[PDB]
Amino acid sequence: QGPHMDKLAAIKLGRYGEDLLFYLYYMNGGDVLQLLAAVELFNRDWRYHKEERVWITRAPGMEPTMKTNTYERGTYYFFDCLNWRKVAKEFHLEYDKLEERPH
Amino acid sequence: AIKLGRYGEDLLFYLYYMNGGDVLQLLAAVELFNRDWRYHKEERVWITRAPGMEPTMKTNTYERGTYYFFDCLNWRKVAKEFHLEYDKLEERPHLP
């Protein structure tokens, strides 16, 4: 790091002006992208579970075995960001544990 | 504002989990510091000397003068006279 990271930062940002630097320090790009991604994910029937802290969605071609006004049982895909994959699991889904539509 | 509906699911998760903004944030900080900007922890703002403006007061623990402040709310560089205590300025950025 140190002088090496100095060099990396210099190669990447050396030619640009202070305005880009601040744009990056306050993560204006990243934060928005993350938001736009959330919106689209939501559009594609992905819901974010608060406790499980992952994106989940009903396995297409499978309706919930049991359903009510507060919860539902069934098979859902869970996104594992650590291994960059999608895994299916029978799960007890409680609606109140889902974030609302982004934005 | 953008039309993401056309791209792969994998790209969406990439944008959500792995856009790399955090890394660019660190590099930005390193670059700011290397261009003589300092970050004031309490004021929560990046600061740099205004050119042609020597400090009015100068002691071994602080100085007073006019400096540039980047106002991230109004998104503009702003000049302000300020009492600057050195030990309130963060050291050069490093890995967390």
PDB file of C-alpha atoms in Angstrom, chain A residues 1-2 5-6 8-31 33-38 40-41 44 46 48 53-55 57 79 81 84 86, chain B residues 1-32 34-35 37 39 44-46 70 72 75 77 92-95:
ATOM      1  CA  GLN A   1       0.000   0.000   0.000  1.00  0.00           C
ATOM      2  CA  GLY A   2       1.161   3.538   0.854  1.00  0.00           C
ATOM      3  CA  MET A   5      -1.698   3.049  -3.463  1.00  0.00           C
ATOM      4  CA  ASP A   6      -0.482   6.604  -4.010  1.00  0.00           C
ATOM      5  CA  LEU A   8      -2.631   3.620  -8.188  1.00  0.00           C
ATOM      6  CA  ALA A   9      -4.629   6.698  -7.178  1.00  0.00           C
ATOM      7  CA  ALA A  10      -2.289   8.864  -9.257  1.00  0.00           C
ATOM      8  CA  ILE A  11      -2.686   6.732 -12.382  1.00  0.00           C
ATOM      9  CA  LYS A  12      -6.461   6.607 -12.010  1.00  0.00           C
ATOM     10  CA  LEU A  13      -7.231  10.149 -10.883  1.00  0.00           C
ATOM     11  CA  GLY A  14      -4.051  12.123 -11.561  1.00  0.00           C
ATOM     12  CA  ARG A  15      -5.394  13.705 -14.739  1.00  0.00           C
ATOM     13  CA  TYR A  16      -8.809  14.651 -13.345  1.00  0.00           C
ATOM     14  CA  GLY A  17      -9.868  17.695 -11.333  1.00  0.00           C
ATOM     15  CA  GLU A  18     -10.933  18.109  -7.713  1.00  0.00           C
ATOM     16  CA  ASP A  19     -14.608  17.846  -8.663  1.00  0.00           C
ATOM     17  CA  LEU A  20     -14.274  14.168  -9.605  1.00  0.00           C
ATOM     18  CA  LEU A  21     -12.374  13.495  -6.386  1.00  0.00           C
ATOM     19  CA  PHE A  22     -15.244  14.826  -4.278  1.00  0.00           C
ATOM     20  CA  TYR A  23     -17.804  13.098  -6.480  1.00  0.00           C
ATOM     21  CA  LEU A  24     -16.004   9.879  -5.569  1.00  0.00           C
ATOM     22  CA  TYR A  25     -15.332  10.603  -1.896  1.00  0.00           C
ATOM     23  CA  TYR A  26     -19.052  11.127  -1.313  1.00  0.00           C
ATOM     24  CA  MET A  27     -19.795   8.012  -3.374  1.00  0.00           C
ATOM     25  CA  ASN A  28     -22.318   9.741  -5.616  1.00  0.00           C
ATOM     26  CA  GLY A  29     -21.882   7.125  -8.327  1.00  0.00           C
ATOM     27  CA  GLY A  30     -21.892   3.969  -6.227  1.00  0.00           C
ATOM     28  CA  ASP A  31     -24.818   4.914  -4.001  1.00  0.00           C
ATOM     29  CA  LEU A  33     -26.111   2.556  -8.912  1.00  0.00           C
ATOM     30  CA  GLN A  34     -26.884   0.502  -5.821  1.00  0.00           C
ATOM     31  CA  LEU A  35     -30.273   2.223  -5.691  1.00  0.00           C
ATOM     32  CA  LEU A  36     -31.075   1.767  -9.383  1.00  0.00           C
ATOM     33  CA  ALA A  37     -30.096  -1.895  -9.062  1.00  0.00           C
ATOM     34  CA  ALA A  38     -32.449  -2.256  -6.105  1.00  0.00           C
ATOM     35  CA  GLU A  40     -34.751  -3.078 -11.032  1.00  0.00           C
ATOM     36  CA  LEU A  41     -34.315  -6.088  -8.753  1.00  0.00           C
ATOM     37  CA  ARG A  44     -38.118  -8.386 -11.255  1.00  0.00           C
ATOM     38  CA  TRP A  46     -36.965  -9.726  -5.865  1.00  0.00           C
ATOM     39  CA  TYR A  48     -35.107  -7.762   0.313  1.00  0.00           C
ATOM     40  CA  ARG A  53     -30.400  -9.662   4.910  1.00  0.00           C
ATOM     41  CA  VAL A  54     -30.497 -11.049   1.376  1.00  0.00           C
ATOM     42  CA  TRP A  55     -32.482 -10.652  -1.820  1.00  0.00           C
ATOM     43  CA  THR A  57     -37.715 -14.305  -4.812  1.00  0.00           C
ATOM     44  CA  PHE A  79     -28.845 -14.668  -3.527  1.00  0.00           C
ATOM     45  CA  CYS A  81     -23.214 -12.579  -2.610  1.00  0.00           C
ATOM     46  CA  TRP A  84     -22.030 -15.184  -6.316  1.00  0.00           C
ATOM     47  CA  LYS A  86     -28.524 -18.317  -6.382  1.00  0.00           C
TER      48      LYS A  86
ATOM     49  CA  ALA B   1     -33.367   7.128 -14.957  1.00  0.00           C
ATOM     50  CA  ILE B   2     -31.500   4.379 -16.819  1.00  0.00           C
ATOM     51  CA  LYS B   3     -33.030   1.346 -18.546  1.00  0.00           C
ATOM     52  CA  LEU B   4     -31.687  -1.639 -16.598  1.00  0.00           C
ATOM     53  CA  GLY B   5     -34.519  -3.886 -17.771  1.00  0.00           C
ATOM     54  CA  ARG B   6     -32.392  -5.171 -20.648  1.00  0.00           C
ATOM     55  CA  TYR B   7     -29.389  -6.471 -18.698  1.00  0.00           C
ATOM     56  CA  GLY B   8     -28.636  -9.700 -16.869  1.00  0.00           C
ATOM     57  CA  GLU B   9     -29.615 -10.457 -13.294  1.00  0.00           C
ATOM     58  CA  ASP B  10     -25.917 -10.952 -12.571  1.00  0.00           C
ATOM     59  CA  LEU B  11     -25.187  -7.362 -13.569  1.00  0.00           C
ATOM     60  CA  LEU B  12     -27.853  -6.077 -11.189  1.00  0.00           C
ATOM     61  CA  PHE B  13     -26.292  -7.850  -8.223  1.00  0.00           C
ATOM     62  CA  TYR B  14     -22.914  -6.597  -9.413  1.00  0.00           C
ATOM     63  CA  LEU B  15     -24.232  -3.037  -9.263  1.00  0.00           C
ATOM     64  CA  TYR B  16     -25.766  -3.640  -5.842  1.00  0.00           C
ATOM     65  CA  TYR B  17     -22.941  -5.507  -4.101  1.00  0.00           C
ATOM     66  CA  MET B  18     -19.807  -4.949  -6.161  1.00  0.00           C
ATOM     67  CA  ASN B  19     -19.836  -1.560  -7.914  1.00  0.00           C
ATOM     68  CA  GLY B  20     -16.497  -0.719  -6.288  1.00  0.00           C
ATOM     69  CA  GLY B  21     -17.543   2.745  -5.147  1.00  0.00           C
ATOM     70  CA  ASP B  22     -15.933   2.040  -1.783  1.00  0.00           C
ATOM     71  CA  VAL B  23     -12.551   1.414  -3.425  1.00  0.00           C
ATOM     72  CA  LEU B  24     -12.789   4.550  -5.569  1.00  0.00           C
ATOM     73  CA  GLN B  25     -13.746   6.390  -2.385  1.00  0.00           C
ATOM     74  CA  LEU B  26     -10.459   5.367  -0.790  1.00  0.00           C
ATOM     75  CA  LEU B  27      -8.448   6.289  -3.888  1.00  0.00           C
ATOM     76  CA  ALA B  28     -10.202   9.670  -3.998  1.00  0.00           C
ATOM     77  CA  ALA B  29      -9.213  10.322  -0.385  1.00  0.00           C
ATOM     78  CA  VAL B  30      -5.604   9.347  -1.071  1.00  0.00           C
ATOM     79  CA  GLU B  31      -5.516  11.704  -4.053  1.00  0.00           C
ATOM     80  CA  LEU B  32      -7.142  14.590  -2.170  1.00  0.00           C
ATOM     81  CA  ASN B  34      -1.755  14.111  -1.956  1.00  0.00           C
ATOM     82  CA  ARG B  35      -3.024  17.372  -3.458  1.00  0.00           C
ATOM     83  CA  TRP B  37      -6.219  18.701   1.136  1.00  0.00           C
ATOM     84  CA  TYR B  39      -9.865  16.351   6.389  1.00  0.00           C
ATOM     85  CA  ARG B  44     -16.436  16.921   8.802  1.00  0.00           C
ATOM     86  CA  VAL B  45     -15.066  18.688   5.738  1.00  0.00           C
ATOM     87  CA  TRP B  46     -12.062  18.693   3.416  1.00  0.00           C
ATOM     88  CA  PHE B  70     -15.637  21.897   0.116  1.00  0.00           C
ATOM     89  CA  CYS B  72     -20.759  18.932   0.058  1.00  0.00           C
ATOM     90  CA  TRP B  75     -21.355  21.145  -3.807  1.00  0.00           C
ATOM     91  CA  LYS B  77     -15.519  25.177  -2.914  1.00  0.00           C
ATOM     92  CA  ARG B  92      -2.912  10.422   5.319  1.00  0.00           C
ATOM     93  CA  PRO B  93      -5.554   7.866   4.256  1.00  0.00           C
ATOM     94  CA  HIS B  94      -4.640   4.212   4.783  1.00  0.00           C
ATOM     95  CA  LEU B  95      -6.280   0.799   4.456  1.00  0.00           C
TER      96      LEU B  95
END
